[PDB]
Structure formats: structure tokens, C-alpha cells
Amino acid sequence: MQIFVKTLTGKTITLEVEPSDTIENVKAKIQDKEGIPPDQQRLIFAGKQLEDGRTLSDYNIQKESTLHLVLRLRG
């Protein structure tokens, strides 16, 4: 299945994932496409922050879903 990830500039990239994939795998695909380390990544779906240890099926992320990427700030 394919999902969409809105990036920092406003453009939307598409990822090729599985419902059995974990969020760390999705962060690795964002690093492999945008060059952002997963330590600086925060993924939001349906207004909730995604935990690294869970799978897309745990968040009920269906086919053609949209995730939001936001860079971690260093304050």
C-alpha cells in the first residue's frame, strides 16, 4: 500500500509501506528520501503523535493515508 507524508516545505511525498511496518521503518524511509535523521522526525496522524514502537495497523492507518512531518526543535 501507499501513504502520503507532508514534508517541511509543503510538498507531499509518497511512501511504499505495509500495515505490519513499524513507525521506525516509516522514519527510515523518510530519511532515505529527505535526508532527515529519525531523531529529528515527528509523525502526526489524526492529530496524534505516533509512537516509534507501534505499527501502522495499531494507528488504523489505512490505504492512502496522510501523515505530517514536523522537525524536532532544539530549545
Place this chain on the structure above:
Amino acid sequence: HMDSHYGFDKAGEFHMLDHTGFAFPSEVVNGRRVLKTTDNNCWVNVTCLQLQFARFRFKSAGLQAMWESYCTGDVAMFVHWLYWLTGVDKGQPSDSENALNMLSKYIVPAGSVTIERVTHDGCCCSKRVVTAPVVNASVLKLGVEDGLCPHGLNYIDKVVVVKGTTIVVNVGKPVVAPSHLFLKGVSYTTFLDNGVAGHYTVFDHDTGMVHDGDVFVPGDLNVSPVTNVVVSE
């Protein structure tokens, strides 16, 4: 016991550690307890400030006893627990919005938010009522795009109805906008890029000033880059 008394995992491991290293000097400002700026603790100061502006409680009586001690001056235990939970080293900067999201599952829900999902010309509409301590949505009345509808048009997610009090964390970069465009809130955390560090600070809408560490500097919401807001009704 330790995990049921305080409401979080590995509670036994944490409570054996030495919390003295995180006893930052603190003062009371406008009834709020704030921390003096040192060791990049500004993200901890603005994080616990929003918990005070939201008048939040913690689910377990043990965690609330830690939070109550923080507000009374005993800040050593809770501040260490914020580093212990978020996995941040002492003296290092961190993300306050990331801290609030990890705190949400331990906080009693004290509010409600209706998120309307509509498109560029009202082709597909839906409403849902969210009841979480922290909700990731647009801090503006505009909203944010959220993918395509069955007609190929982008959804827009905005907060239209607010009940009680909740923390709305923005889904994007720190945003600057006119004040009358933000959601009606009581406190706004702003994040300034000083040039690769950053400074967290809270804008009190009531007093019209700004919480900066342990002092009370002036500020303008129209030029503040807001990252999250304690929305209330």
C-alpha cells in the same frame, strides 16, 4: 506496586535514581512556578508552564504528588522525570511539543475539541469530537491540509468548537500571524531561532506579557512564532 502507585512503567528504576542534579532554581511569577534559565532548561520551563495554564492533573495519584511538589518548589523530582521519560540528557536542548505529546497519556483529559474536516469548496465534510490532553492541530483558524478527498481536493482540519481546556500543538513549523487568527487561548509558547540553538518562552494572553525563564518580559502575539497554545473557552 511502584508501577501502579505512580502510573508509569519502570517506576521502580526511576525512583531509585538521584534527582538532585535537576533541582533548578525556581521562583513564583504571577502564581505560576517558573525555572531560571540554565542548562538549556527552557523547554522544561515552557512545558510545565502549559501544564499550569491548562490546570491539568495526572491520572495516578503518585504522578500528581510529584507534579504538586514541582509547583510548590520541589522541582527536582518532576524535572528529572521529564528527562527520564523523553530520553533527553541533562544540559541538552529538547522539543517542548514532543514532551507534551509523551505526557498526554498520563494527564487526565480536562477538555474537548471539535475538529471539522472540509475541503476547498465543501465537497466532503465530517466532524469529530476529540477529548485528549494534547491534540496536534493547527493553532490558527485556517487549518492544515490533510490529503485528498474522493474528488481529488485537499481536506482542511480546523478547530471550530472548544469545550474545557486542552493543549493544541501545532502541526508544523513555528508560525507567525496576526493575533486574531490564532485559536482563542490563554497562553502561547513561542520558539525563536537565535541563529543551532533556540529559545522557548510563553506568552500570557491575560497579562499581555511573556514568561521568559523566571522574569516577565514584554511581548507581542502578532510577532510571536507560536508552536502550541492552551486553548480554552
